[PDB]
Design a binder for this molecule. Structure first.
Ligand SMILES: CCCCCCCCCCCCCCCCCC(=O)OCC(COC(=O)CCCCCCCCCCCCCCCCC)OC(=O)CCCCCCCCCCCCCCCCC
Ligand SMILES: CCCCCCCCCCCCCCCCCC(=O)OCC(COC(=O)CCCCCCCCCCCCCCCCC)OC(=O)CCCCCCCCCCCCCCCCC
Ligand SMILES: CCCCCCCCCCCCCCCCCC(=O)OCC(COC(=O)CCCCCCCCCCCCCCCCC)OC(=O)CCCCCCCCCCCCCCCCC
Ligand code: HEA
Ligand code: HEA
Ligand SMILES: CCCCC/C=C\C/C=C\C/C=C\C/C=C\CCCC(=O)O[C@H](COC(=O)CCCCCCCCCCCCCCCCC)COP(=O)(O)OCCN
Ligand SMILES: CCCCCC/C=C\CCCCCCCCCC(=O)O[C@H](COC(=O)CCCCCCCCCCCCCCC)COP(=O)(O)OC[C@@H](O)CO
Ligand SMILES: CCCCCC/C=C\CCCCCCCCCC(=O)O[C@H](COC(=O)CCCCCCCCCCCCCCC)COP(=O)(O)OC[C@@H](O)CO
Ligand SMILES: CCCCCCCCCCO[C@@H]1O[C@H](CO)[C@@H](O[C@H]2O[C@H](CO)[C@@H](O)[C@H](O)[C@H]2O)[C@H](O)[C@H]1O
Ligand SMILES: CCCCCCCCCCO[C@@H]1O[C@H](CO)[C@@H](O[C@H]2O[C@H](CO)[C@@H](O)[C@H](O)[C@H]2O)[C@H](O)[C@H]1O
Ligand SMILES: C[C@H](CCC(=O)O)[C@H]1CC[C@H]2[C@@H]3[C@H](O)C[C@@H]4C[C@H](O)CC[C@]4(C)[C@H]3C[C@H](O)[C@]12C
Ligand SMILES: C[C@H](CCC(=O)O)[C@H]1CC[C@H]2[C@@H]3[C@H](O)C[C@@H]4C[C@H](O)CC[C@]4(C)[C@H]3C[C@H](O)[C@]12C
Ligand SMILES: C[C@H](CCC(=O)O)[C@H]1CC[C@H]2[C@@H]3[C@H](O)C[C@@H]4C[C@H](O)CC[C@]4(C)[C@H]3C[C@H](O)[C@]12C
Ligand code: CUA
Ligand SMILES: [O-][O-]
Ligand SMILES: [Cu+2]
Ligand SMILES: [Mg+2]
Ligand code: NA
Lengths: 73, 105, 84, 144, 43, 46, 58, 227, 49, 514
């Protein structure tokens, strides 16, 4: 209501850049964590789960029964 | 590397040179607005008085324009500047761009 | 060859400093990295008392006469084999 | 409005927010009235009327900062025209499909695809994630 | 950049002509060859 | 000496925009058409 | 031999407007026309050979 | 084999192909991050009225934009080279099979004991049995034992070819006068498809590879059956 | 004074987007293009052997 | 006078104009070939024929785009027009030899045309590997005409390289050091050194293929003790430098365009940009065998080539971040040229990154000779080299011609092209990861959706090409003559007006040493 106080007048561009480069880092950090869960670990779990109790003979017998093979009717 | 205070003082001295010529006035303002800052009121004050000594009213208005422009979205800088310059604006009879309607398309 | 670079006009200190920091020292840094990756001891091989190796025609003039000057117990066997 | 061609070798006027004080005045050749205004300008600016101050400004500068910084409706034309030409491209594709391309192979027929799909599930194509992983081998249906 | 006004302005109608001619000059010969592909693979 | 200035430093005339349009159409069109006609030539050859 | 370079300097600096490849005189024009005729004719001939080689022949 | 609308790698059928899947995930995360940072910074540079047009000093910031990419490159190269040397390790196989590329089909030789050889041709679309795969089936598949280390030797009797099976992570060029070796190990039975991967003329698109992976006892039965 | 974009930009944008969407939708759905979508959730497997 | 001016030229500007016209015409030919490619693949089955006609088209597409469109436009066109102006020189060092570099190119192109008209064409790939390219699998004249086409293009560029290096070293103002010359001039100098050193090796290799085909040598024939893989080494010792040759003048133009339309007097980090281009040029000579990771090389060699290839990312990233830092703080002018350059920075970066994926020889086993590679190089070529070409063309067209373009039309053109190239090439990453091979006229059914979309994208880019032609016509039709441009104090090529007089700098600039 009285006199206006002096705002920051120097280095406004540099201040904006610093704030948003830091912000971009945080988002990158964030996204790296998302990707590890949703992609890399997801894929590691899917292969580990598939094989943990996988029965390759049983798999073959199912395929053989369906007629898929030339050499094993 | 100089302090802000030593930078500002060089620029005040620059514009306060009594026989500054038109070329030096333009060189000064055109160089200053290249920096990452809005010039301190004490600098603008000296540049406006150089305009007076060079009988150049239009450049005085233009200098207020570029001060506002250099603040970008920081809307509080220009009213603070104008407040700090109002004594000089009154003494020299400088109308602001807004008072002249030069702020509307 | 013209190598693959290409910057004359009147050779000078500035160009050679450019080469020093922009090519020479980076190459040293790369080779320093490469070497620190491949360091780490290698298995010392079985000792075999080959007669063309561990030559002793006269005792060395230091030590007990039987140790080379930069003898490394880990990788340099004596004529009788690796030390304990 | 058709200017000079020694202009390239002479200082010229520019409206540029980072070059606020151009090398020449907007108006080079002054009228008698304008010359008189410039004389008045050597006296106190307080004695200048608003209308006269604007005219001093317009002798020196072409556009004010607000004027030179104005946004435009051009993006509407650009985006709309681009979509028109991308739309026109689909007419080329329709033409190509009608007059150039013949039938695709019989392996795309619905019954072939149904059989092919079973044979792929029978050989457990991509069973960890890609394809058979998405079939419920117990319930004999696509996993929901 | 600054420029003089066009010496020989090209109206929207003239532009429609220039555009149409340009597009046709690309499309019609290729179109004719591609239309007749079957006619070529049999001679 | 040679002619200089806009429209004069080029091996084609821009004196008439419709003659120019014919020229440019023949120029770019012939390059774009050539591969289609070479393909047709190879297909027809044998 | 004697040094007759000065007389060739006078010949090739004569202000007659001729480009350097013709400034030696009428012999230059003959050699140029021979060269260009062989080049352009040879090029036309290469085009005929393309046309012949472009179709099943022999 | 690939399936409709596939975005990524075929499901891994060998341990090395799984390693490559996990390494691709790691590298693609970095590619996505760097791509998106560059796009973001472009938008950041373009969205402010604030200006700074005088000379900027570059030295300090260029340390960061060399050191950080150098570290990223090392973080890619470390697992990349680990997998490379893994692929190369001595493994002693129990079976050697040769394949010879031809224009345009593959032949196979199993000459560890018997002298078995045969040709393997694409099934034409007009001869596919219902539900079989266009451009991918062959008349004679490469029968192989599952869960065993197999040495494949690759060459050519005419032009270059390349012998590939994407779900096993395999691609070995077929070069006349040269005998290239690769190692094959399938974790699962089944049918595994690939296609000629070096341009070789008229029917490059039409000389596929089909492996048929079966239990050892069934492989032995098949071999015995060829006497 | 109003330029080309003031006078026509709204119409160019609206008509451009409308034409583009309509023609690509037609091309994609009405002329027999085979997109070959995934059979997952779509195709009923049918006996082949 | 017309023949004297345009067939007998010794003028760097007119010779640059000839190159630009030649390269534009070649661009139409290469665009038509690319559409024939994508028409063949635009639905499953066969459209044209088997892989022979298809791969004659593919082979010609690549040769035309690289040797007759990009290099003539960037180096012959922009290089001849701009380099002398940017250093205040009155012409090139060898103004008459310069004209021969130009006139060797129509014969080179004619030989390429002839190759495709005789016999069954050269359906070899632009790599021309034996034995497919030998005299048993490619009997007859087609491959030999292709070799001769490359020989003439090679001589053209080698002599042009000698001209540019000499001009740039010898014809600057006496006060101007190499560290006062503009970045585009640097980029042409470095490109020229790469051409000088790499093309003679290509020439050796294709000459050995010619003698294997015609004089009963066996450099590449195992029956004589030769080796097909030797050809590949010789070819790629040239062919990796060649892709840096294709992009370096583009880097130089991008530096100028980004500087200009950011309202800056100078690019950020000038000496770092020089360093980065020199580093890229040097490293570009020691990485070639990353084109050969599946041929059977020893593991340690694969490790070295993986590592040396990835290190090029470091200087390249310096340039990318320096362009961003040049934008930083700018008064941005959203001109059409700026749009091309911004698209360049982002899309070149994507393509460079998938190049780094391929540098990993373990993953390259599965990605080699698939559409993943095609996606990589069309991002750096269709969306890098070409975007730099379009940005420089729109930026400097008023200098070369004296007339302005219609900026709105040019922005529309950019928008169409951006959609078209991304629709064309982004799905090709999926096709590659999922195993679709290169150089195939038809594909297993599973690959249909992305091939269909990619072919649709190729038609959108065709519409952009057609529109460009119209835009150039409109500019010459309307005749808006340039008056002034901004920033001439840091863009010397503009300071003699538009177009500059036939002779410029007859009185050289004055530059003193303080
Ligand atoms: C924010 C910047 C991010 C850039 C990062 C991208 C990097 C890579 C490519 C970098 C490419 C640059 C992007 C251009 C942004 C233009 C602002 C003008 O304003 C001025 O007076 C001067 C000061 C400018 C300050 C900016 C304020 C904007 C005001 C107007 C609003 C514009 C709305 C545009 C709306 C655009 C919507 C697309 C006005 C004319 C704008 C023309 C836009 C064409 C964009 C084509 C891209 C493909 C679209 C496909 C459409 C057809 C598709 C059909 C399927
Ligand atoms: C400096 C400003 C410009 C800078 C920017 C450049 C502009 C860029 C866009 C350019 C926009 C303008 C386009 C202008 C069209 C030119 C007319 C000459 O033209 C004139 O004299 C026209 C005006 C006077 C009229 C004379 C009568 C002509 C009648 C018929 C002529 C038909 C022309 C078409 C005939 C078609 C030509 C081929 C001399 C020029 C030589 C340039 C090389 C051409 C490409 C040859 C390719 C090799 C073929 C091998 C086979 C290859 C086989 C393939 C495998
Ligand atoms: C301008 C428009 C023109 C139109 C043409 C298109 C343009 C391209 C825009 C497209 C916008 C791209 C945004 C990221 C795309 C990732 C798609 C994906 O799911 O990728 C998956 C991976 C493999 O993944 C897998 O193995 C498993 C996938 C399935 C995950 C589980 C979910 C199951 C359902 C899947 C739903 C889909 C998920 C997507 C989720 C979506 C997340 C974003 O494929 C790949 O690696 C392909 C990677 C290619 C390498 C370049 C990467 C760096 C580009 C970053 C900027 C883009 C520039 C675009 C180029 C420029 C773009 C402007
Ligand atoms: C303009 C042309 C051009 C350019 C510039 C490049 C640049 C690169 N290319 Fe590419 N390339 C081609 C054109 C080009 N390429 C062509 C035509 C082929 C195929 C030839 C054929 O077979 O016909 C090909 C093939 C090719 C292969 C062979 C793949 C195969 O056949 O199996 C490889 C493998 O390493 C490769 C890698 C690279 C790399 C690492 C770069 C690097 O220079 C890219 C560096 C750039 C960046 C990395 C992005 C910017 C950097 C940053 C933002 C910093 C931070 C980044 C990181 C930390 C990673 N390219
Ligand atoms: C500069 C190089 C370049 C460019 C620009 C292009 C552009 C395109 N390419 Fe190209 N392509 C190659 C180089 C290039 N290509 C190479 C080297 C190969 C491998 C060959 C081999 O395997 O042996 C290849 C292979 C290749 C294939 C794989 C074939 C196969 O493996 O079977 C495909 C398929 O879609 C393809 C499609 C396209 C498309 C749709 C474009 C489109 O984006 C083209 C669109 C049009 C333009 C980009 C305009 C061009 C014109 C100008 C720029 C002139 C402008 C005029 C003035 C300024 C006056 N290309
Ligand atoms: C460390 C980094 C290198 C720095 C240089 C080191 C020493 C240089 C000294 C002079 C070198 C000149 C040749 C001398 C001969 C042998 C020295 C060879 C270099 C050396 O230092 O060799 C060492 C042996 O030194 C030995 O025998 C004995 C070492 C000392 C004996 C010197 C004998 C006198 C030689 C006289 C030469 C006269 C030359 C006159 C020339 C005039 C012409 C090797 O150590 P090691 O334990 O065997 O193996 C390592 C196993 N872990
Ligand atoms: C059913 C309908 C299908 C339509 C399909 C096409 C769709 C999209 C078309 C969109 C075209 C946009 C083209 C750019 C228009 C803006 C150009 C502009 O804004 O540039 C300014 C235009 O000026 C001016 O008058 C204005 C001049 C405006 C010219 C507009 C011309 C349009 C031509 C369209 C041709 C379409 C053909 C379709 C096929 C039949 C000129 O700039 P300066 O020289 O600096 O100033 C000079 C001043 O004196 C001008 O007054
Ligand atoms: C398979 C069959 C393939 C056949 C391909 C044949 C290709 C081309 C036919 C060549 C016809 C050549 C005719 C003579 C050319 C002489 C050029 C020359 O001598 O150029 C000189 C410059 O090059 C210099 O010096 C540098 C030194 C001179 C360079 C001369 C090079 C001649 C070209 C040979 C091919 C080189 C390939 C190299 C790599 C393998 C002079 O330059 P100008 O601009 O003229 O003048 C400048 C004035 O100031 C001079 O007073
Ligand atoms: C990949 C790039 C190619 C892009 C696609 C081109 C888009 C279409 C352009 C139009 O081309 C024309 O199409 C006509 C058909 O609409 C053809 O007329 C043909 O068909 C007519 C109707 O059946 C007959 O009247 C004519 O005699 C017969 O020539 C004509 O030859 C062809 O020029
Ligand atoms: C200005 C410069 C322009 C030059 C134009 C020269 C034109 C000469 C063409 O003459 C042809 O030469 C062929 C050879 O090129 C001859 O084939 C003959 O030559 C070969 C032996 O040299 C063999 O193919 C056969 O014996 C025989 O048919 C053929 O009869 C004849 O038509
Ligand atoms: C369409 C044709 C050019 C076709 C070509 O370039 O291939 C040209 C030749 C002469 C032109 C005509 C006249 O010479 C000039 C007139 C100019 C008006 O502004 C448009 C119609 C106008 C009456 C033109 C119509 C059209 O542009 C014509 C008919
Ligand atoms: C010394 C030379 C030129 C300096 C000059 O005379 O102006 C400069 C120009 C580019 C610089 C290089 C680039 O900035 C890239 C690298 C940046 C790192 O911060 C140091 C090493 C680094 C490799 C630099 C070394 C050196 O400072 C270089 C090579
Ligand atoms: C590829 C080339 C052989 C080409 C040939 O077959 O004609 C050979 C010759 C010399 C080899 C290099 C030298 O042997 C030195 C290095 C040895 C390392 O084990 C691999 C990288 C290393 C840098 C080698 C890479 C590559 O195998 C090179 C460059
Ligand atoms: Cu065999 Cu390709
Ligand atoms: O070549 O990348
Ligand atoms: Cu390479
Ligand atoms: Mg290969
Ligand atoms: Na096809």
């Amino acid at each position: 209501s009285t006199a206006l106080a002096k705002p920051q007048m120097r280095g406004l561009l540099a201040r904006r850049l610093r704030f948003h480069i830091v912000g971009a880092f945080m988002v990158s950090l964030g996204f790296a964590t998302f990707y590890k869960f949703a992609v890399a670990e997801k894929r590691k779990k899917a292969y580990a789960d598939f094989y943990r109790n996988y029965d390759s003979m049983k798999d073959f017998e199912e395929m053989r029964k369906a007629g898929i093979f030339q050499s094993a009717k | 590397h100089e302090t802000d205070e030593e930078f500002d003082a060089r620029w005040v001295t620059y514009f306060n040179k009594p026989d500054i010529d038109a070329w030096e006035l333009r060189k000064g303002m055109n160089t200053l607005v290249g920096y990452d800052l809005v010039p301190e009121p004490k600098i603008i004050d000296a540049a406006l008085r150089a305009c007076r000594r060079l009988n150049d009213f239009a450049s005085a208005v233009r200098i207020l324009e570029v001060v506002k422009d250099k603040a970008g979205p920081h809307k509080e800088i220009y009213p603070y500047v104008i407040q700090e310059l109002r004594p000089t604006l009154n003494e020299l009879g400088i109308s602001t761009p807004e008072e002249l309607g030069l702020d509307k398309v | 060859a013209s190598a693959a670079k290409g910057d004359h006009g009147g050779t000078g200190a500035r160009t050679w400093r450019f080469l020093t920091f922009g090519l020479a020292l980076p190459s040293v840094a790369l080779c320093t990295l490469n070497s620190w990756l491949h360091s780490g001891h290698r298995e010392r091989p079985a000792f075999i008392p080959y007669h063309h190796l561990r030559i002793r025609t006269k005792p060395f003039s230091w030590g007990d006469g039987n140790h080379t000057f930069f003898h490394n117990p880990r990788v340099n066997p004596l004529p009788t084999g690796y030390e304990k | 409005s058709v200017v000079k061609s020694e202009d390239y070798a002479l200082p010229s006027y520019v409206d540029r927010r980072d070059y606020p004080l151009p090398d020449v005045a907007h108006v080079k050749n002054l009228s008698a009235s304008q010359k008189a205004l410039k004389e008045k300008e050597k006296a106190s600016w307080s004695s200048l009327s608003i209308d006269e101050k604007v005219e001093l400004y317009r002798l020196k500068f072409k556009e004010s900062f607000a004027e030179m910084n104005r946004s435009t409706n051009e993006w509407k034309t650009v985006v709309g025209a681009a979509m028109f030409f991308i739309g026109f491209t689909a007419l080329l594709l329709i033409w190509e499909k009608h007059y150039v391309y013949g039938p695709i192979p019989h392996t795309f027929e619905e019954e072939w695809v149904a059989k092919q799909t079973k044979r792929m599930l029978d050989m457990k194509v991509a069973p960890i994630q890609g394809f058979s992983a998405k079939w419920d081998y117990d319930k004999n249906e696509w996993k929901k | 950049i600054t420029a003089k006004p066009a010496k020989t302005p090209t109206s929207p109608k003239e532009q429609a002509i220039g555009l149409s001619v340009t597009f046709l000059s690309f499309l019609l010969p290729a179109g004719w060859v591609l239309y007749h592909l079957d006619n070529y693979k049999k001679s | 000496h040679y002619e200089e200035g806009p429209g004069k430093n080029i091996p084609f005339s821009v004196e008439n925009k419709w003659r120019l349009l014919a020229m440019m159409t023949l120029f770019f069109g012939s390059g774009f058409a050539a591969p289609f006609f070479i393909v047709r030539h190879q297909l027809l050859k044998k | 031999f004697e040094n007759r370079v000065a007389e060739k300097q006078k010949l090739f600096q004569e202000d007659n407007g001729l480009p350097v490849h013709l400034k030696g005189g009428a012999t230059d024009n003959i050699l140029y026309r021979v060269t260009m005729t062989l080049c352009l004719g040879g090029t036309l001939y290469s085009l005929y050979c393309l046309g012949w080689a472009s179709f099943p022949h022999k | 084999m690939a399936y409709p609308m596939q975005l990524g790698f075929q499901d891994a059928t060998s341990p090395i192909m799984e390693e490559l899947l996990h390494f691709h995930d790691h590298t693609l995360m970095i590619v996505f991050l760097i791509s998106s940072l560059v796009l973001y910074i472009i938008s950041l540079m373009l969205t402010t009225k604030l200006t700074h047009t005088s000379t900027m000093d570059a030295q300090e910031v260029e340390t960061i934009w060399t050191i950080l990419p150098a570290i990223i490159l090392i973080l890619i190269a470390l697992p990349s080279l680990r997998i490379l040397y893994m692929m190369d390790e001595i493994n002693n196989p129990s079976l050697t099979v040769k394949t010879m590329g031809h224009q345009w089909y593959w032949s196979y030789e199993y000459t560890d004991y018997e002298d078995l050889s045969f040709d393997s041709y694409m099934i034409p679309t007009s001869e596919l049995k219902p539900g079989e795969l266009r451009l991918l089936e062959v008349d004679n598949r490469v029968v192989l034992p599952m869960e065993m280390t197999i040495r494949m030797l690759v060459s050519s009797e005419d032009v270059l070819h390349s012998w590939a099976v994407p779900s096993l992570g395999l691609k070995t060029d077929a070069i006349p006068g040269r005998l290239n070796q690769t190692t094959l190990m399938s974790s699962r039975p089944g049918l595994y498809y690939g296609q000629c991967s070096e341009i070789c003329g008229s029917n490059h698109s039409f000389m596929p590879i089909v492996l048929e992976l079966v239990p050892l006892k069934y492989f032995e039965k098949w071999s015995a059956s060829m006497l | 004074a109003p330029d080309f974009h003031d006078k026509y930009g709204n119409a160019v944008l609206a008509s451009g987007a409308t034409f583009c969407v309509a023609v690509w939708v037609y091309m994609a759905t009405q002329i027999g293009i085979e997109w070959n979508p995934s059979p997952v959730g779509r195709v009923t497997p049918k006996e082949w052997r | 006078m017309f023949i004297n001016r345009w067939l007998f030229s010794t003028n760097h500007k007119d010779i640059g104009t000839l190159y630009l016209l030649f390269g534009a015409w070649a661009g139409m030919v290469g665009t038509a070939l690319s559409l024939l490619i994508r028409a063949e693949l635009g639905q499953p089955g066969t459209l044209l024929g088997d892989d022979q006609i298809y791969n004659v088209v593919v082979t010609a597409h690549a040769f035309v785009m690289i040797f007759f469109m990009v290099m003539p436009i960037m180096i012959g066109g922009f290089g001849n027009w701009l380099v002398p102006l940017m250093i205040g020189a009155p012409d090139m060092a060898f103004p008459r030899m310069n004209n021969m570099s130009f006139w060797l190119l129509p014969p080179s192109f004619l030989l390429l045309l002839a190759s495709s008209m005789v016999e069954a064409g050269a359906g070899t790939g632009w790599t021309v590997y034996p034995p497919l390219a030998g005299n048993l699998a490619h009997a007859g004249a087609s491959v030999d005409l292709t070799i001769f086409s490359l020989h003439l293009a090679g001589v053209s560029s080698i002599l042009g390289a000698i001209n540019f290096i000499t001009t740039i070293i010898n014809m600057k103002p006496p006060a101007m050091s190499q560290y006062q010359t503009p970045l585009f001039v640097w980029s042409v100098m470095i490109t020229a050194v790469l051409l000088l050193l790499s093309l003679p090796v290509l020439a050796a290799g294709i000459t050995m293929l010619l003698t294997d085909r015609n004089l009963n040598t066996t450099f590449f024939d195992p029956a004589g003790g030769g080796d097909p893989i030797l050809y590949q080494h010789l070819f790629w010792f040239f062919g990796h430098p060649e892709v840096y040759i294709l992009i370096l003048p583009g880097f130089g133009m991008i530096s100028h365009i980004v500087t200009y339309y950011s309202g800056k007097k100078e690019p950020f980090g000038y000496m770092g940009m020089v360093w980065a281009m020199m580093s890229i040029g040097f490293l570009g000579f020691i990485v070639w065998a990353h084109h050969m990771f599946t041929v059977g090389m020893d593991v340690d060699t694969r490790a070295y080539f993986t590592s040396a290839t990835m290190i090029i990312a470091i200087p390249t990233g310096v340039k990318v971040f320096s362009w961003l830092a040049t934008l930083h703080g700018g008064n941005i002018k959203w001109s059409p040229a700026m749009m091309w350059a911004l698209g360049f920075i982002f899309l070149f970066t994507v393509g460079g990154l998938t190049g780094i994926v391929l540098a990993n020889s373990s993953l390259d086993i599965v990605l080699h000779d698939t559409y993943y590679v095609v996606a990589h190089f069309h991002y750096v070529l269709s969306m890098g080299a070409v975007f730099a070409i379009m940005g420089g063309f729109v930026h400097w067209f008023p200098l070369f011609s004296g007339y302005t373009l219609n900026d709105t039309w040019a922005k529309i053109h950019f928008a169409i092209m951006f959609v078209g190239v991304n629709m064309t090439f982004f799905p090709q990453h999926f096709l590659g990861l999922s195993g679709m091979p290169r150089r195939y006229s038809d594909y297993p059914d599973a690959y249909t959706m992305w091939n269909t979309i990619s072919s649709m994208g190729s038609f959108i880019s065709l519409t952009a090409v057609m529109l460009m032609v119209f835009i150039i016509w409109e500019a010459f039709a309307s005749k808006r003559e340039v008056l002034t441009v901004d920033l001439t104090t840091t863009n010397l090529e503009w300071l003699n007006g538009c177009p500059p007089p036939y002779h410029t700098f007859e009185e050289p600039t004055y530059v003193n040493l303080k």
